[PDB]
Structure formats: C-alpha cells, structure tokens
Write a protein that binds this ligand. Sequence first.
Ligand SMILES: COC(=O)N[C@H]1CCC[C@@H]1[C@](CN1CCC1)(c1cccc(F)c1)C1CCN(CC2CN(c3ccc(S(=O)(=O)C4CN(C(=O)CCCN5CCCCC5)C4)cc3)C2)CC1
Length: 481
Amino acid sequence: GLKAAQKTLFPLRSIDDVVRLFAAELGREEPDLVLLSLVLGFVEHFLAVNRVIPTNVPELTFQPSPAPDGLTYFPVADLSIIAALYARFTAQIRGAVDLSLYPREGGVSSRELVKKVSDVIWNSLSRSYFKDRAHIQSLFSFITGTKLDSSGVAFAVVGACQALGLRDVHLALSEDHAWVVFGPNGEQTAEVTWHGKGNEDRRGQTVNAGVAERSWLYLKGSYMRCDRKMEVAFMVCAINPSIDLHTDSLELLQLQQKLLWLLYDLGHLERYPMALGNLADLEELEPTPGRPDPLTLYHKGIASAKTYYRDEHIYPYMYLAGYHCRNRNVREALQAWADTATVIQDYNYCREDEEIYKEFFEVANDVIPNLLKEAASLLEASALQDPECFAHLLRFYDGICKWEEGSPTPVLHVGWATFLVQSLGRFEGQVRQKVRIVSGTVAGTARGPVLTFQSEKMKGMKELLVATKINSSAIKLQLTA
Ligand SMILES: COC(=O)N[C@H]1CCC[C@@H]1[C@](CN1CCC1)(c1cccc(F)c1)C1CCN(CC2CN(c3ccc(S(=O)(=O)C4CN(C(=O)CCCN5CCCCC5)C4)cc3)C2)CC1
C-alpha cells in the first residue's frame, strides 16, 4: 500500500521532485518497485512517447520552467493519477492470486506460487504488438497498454510478487535475458518471459541447462542476482530517453543521470557493471561538475565485472571500446575489443546468443574495417604503423576462434574470412613482423609486442599472419575450417 511517507512527496512537478521520491524510497527497508516504475513510465510517456500536451484532459497539468537554450514543460505526476494506477495494479494481482491456496513455509515462496504470479502477468498482455518497440518496459506500459518487452515481463513478475508480500522473489539478469531467483537461499530459479524471435516457451523451468551449456545468455552462472536496490537500478537503466531514431529527451537523459548518481553514491552500482557504463556514456554527453571522468567510470564497470562476476561479462569492455571509437582512439578501441573477445573465448556459441554474435560480426566486419580504412586515409598527408594495434587485432580473432571451439554451431564463415585478409593487409609487413607470436618457453617465475594464441585456428595460421605476402586462400581456408 501507499503510505504518508510516500504520498507527501507528491506532486512531482520536476526532475528533482522525482529524484527526491527515489532518494526517500531507497532509504526504506523495502523500496516500492511498482510506485517507482509507474512514475518513470508516466514521465517517460509525455517526455518521449506522446509529447503533444493534451487539450481535453483535465486534472493532467504541465509544469513550465527555464530550459537551457525558452521554456520546457514537465508532466506533473499528481498523487491522484499515480495512486489510481498503483491501486489498479495491486487490485489486479491480489484479485487473481489467492495466497491461502499456497503454503508459505516460513517466508518462502514455492515454485507453484512463482509460476501463478508469472501466469497472471503473462495472460494480461495484449495478443499482438511489436516486441522490440521502445517504451514498453515499465509498469505504466503494463497498466495503460498491457504491453511489456522481454525483460519488462520479468521485472513485472518481481513487482507483482512484492505487492503480494513475497520478499524472497528477485530479479535475475544476464546481459541479454531476465528470470527470477527465489527460495530459502535464492538458489531456486524460474523462467518467466520469452527470449529471442520464435525460440519456444521455457517459462516455469530452471536456468540450469543454459548455465551447464556455457552459453553467454546464462553467463556460465555468474549472472546478476538483484536485491531490491539493484531492481531500482535496473528500472533506472531501463529509462529510454529516445524520442525517435535520431533525437533524445533532454529531461529523461538528465533524470536517468541524476538517478544513476543517487544509486552510485549509495553503493548500489558496485555490483551492476553495465549501469556504470551507462553513467559514463551520460557523463560524456553532459559532464556534471565534481564527478569522475567517463573513462574512470568505464574502468569501474570492468572492475565490478572482475570483482563480483569472475570477469565473465562482455558489455563493460564493449562500453569502453564504444567510448574510444567515438573519440577515434584506434589502439585503445582495438585493445578493448580484444579484451571483449578474451572474455567470450571461454564460452560456447549456442542458438540463443545471436545478440552477441551480431555485435562481434559487426565489429570484425564493419567497425574495425571502417576504423582501419579511415586510419589509412590519415596516413596520406599512424595506428597502422603501431605493431600493438596489430597484436590487438590478432588477439581479437583468437578469442572468436577459441569461442567457436566446442560450440554446437560454427561462428566463422566465408563472410568473416574476407575482412580478416583486408584488415591484416592494412598493416605493412615490417609492422606485422614486429609482433612476436610465442607459446612461452618456461612456465612460472623463480625466487616489439609479444602475443600468445589460446585457439587452435590462430596457432595453425601463426607464420601466415606475419608473412610479407599474404596467402589469402590459406588464411581464409584455416579461419573457415
Ligand atoms: C545499462 O543498461 C541496461 O542494463 N539496460 C537494460 C535495462 C532494460 C533492458 C536493458 C537491456 C536490453 N537489451 C535486450 C536487447 C538489448 C538488457 C539488459 C539485461 C538483460 C536484458 F534482458 C536486457 C540492455 C541494454 C544495454 N546493453 C548494453 C549496451 C549495448 N552495448 C554496446 C556497446 C558497444 C558496442 S560496439 O560494438 O563497440 C559499437 C561500435 N561502436 C562505435 O562507437 C563505432 C565507432 C564510432 N563511430 C561510428 C560512427 C561514426 C562516428 C563514431 C559502438 C555495441 C554494443 C552497450 C545491454 C542490454
């Protein structure tokens, strides 16, 4: 229910009023996910979904204020609008789940209870809508339009469980999928949403098969297990400032940035690597005085992945590579993509890993070839003269090759082979042979660049990659075999 401590902070007539609600809620023993998701969805609706201020709607008012280069109008989150939306969600869940039928073994939710709550959210959704549509992530979207994206359904099941008073059900997250964790120690797992485009319905099952398989989608079991504060962080990361393909809401960017600093300062981003990369992206767009630099924040994201998730996360390095690409730091961008491939090498490419395959396919066959092409234009009146860039390029391919080893389906095909030959060819013979590809002579210690290949394919290509005249057919045949 909504208490006085919550209601007295309403109405929210500004960005700072919304931040105050979140600061107050984060200080409570159990932060209300439903209320916080509704507010974000309400303000996102008028700031990005339908910016045209309604004429025939009374009660709904907008707050003018000075915009940094005339006026800007903020959707006033009235207590009556939000409280009615909140009451409608609560009434729906409580009315569909009869908790007397479920034996709560000392504050522990059964699989049967978690599956019923999942079935309630699932059966409420519209029969037909575009799944990759923007702004269908929040509880506002679930209540006003019965539309939720993939991870939105997972968050809604958690929100619904909290409303029923089930403190043991939590959000579980990988870098591309979401499920719930529950039980006496949070070691019980259940699928609650779909994943991919026509990849069946595994809803109600454990994530064991996905973890045992070594797919990137289940991160070999080193996935995030959210507490309530991390679920608030997820919801803030889930804010979509996109108005259209090329424009953003300056208010939603400013709101997500201020909310991410709030979460950061309380230490709730310490175990959320991708939130730190998101904050760093926001800081580069609009630096806030007294705060650390985007580079410091990207490295804090990598440090979190290393400390709490045994360095099995891809996107913290991808965020840093993104920064360096935008700023045209070729060496530092190639280094961060090679570090991404060093992580993926200990995974096996499975059916539902298309999201990360598409990411690697694009860097290896579009982004890197585009970078080295632009770098070659700059040489005609530098990074291509640096043997360290060449070693990063080879370590990157080494990771992709090793990733393919032990995989049920191939990674590298004829399409990759072409861009490897072209990318190798962008470095002169003298620069390429400065790299020492060694296996190591002695193991341990006693009281030009050097590179070691972890993959069979790059190892068998050793001499070809470094030869003055590139044997295209042989490099293509070995990469695709
Ligand atoms: C922090 O935010 C979140 O956690 N968001 C969550 C909340 C709601 C759900 C959302 C989401 C959504 N997914 C579902 C499909 C997308 C998610 C997370 C966990 C579980 C889950 F189910 C869903 C995530 C969204 C954020 N992504 C992370 C980002 C993708 N990524 C990224 C970074 C770099 C590259 S890159 O390949 O390096 C590339 C090339 N490069 C360049 O800059 C080129 C050179 C420059 N040049 C080019 C043009 C000329 C000038 C500049 C960028 C690619 C992707 C960062 C993860 C999934």
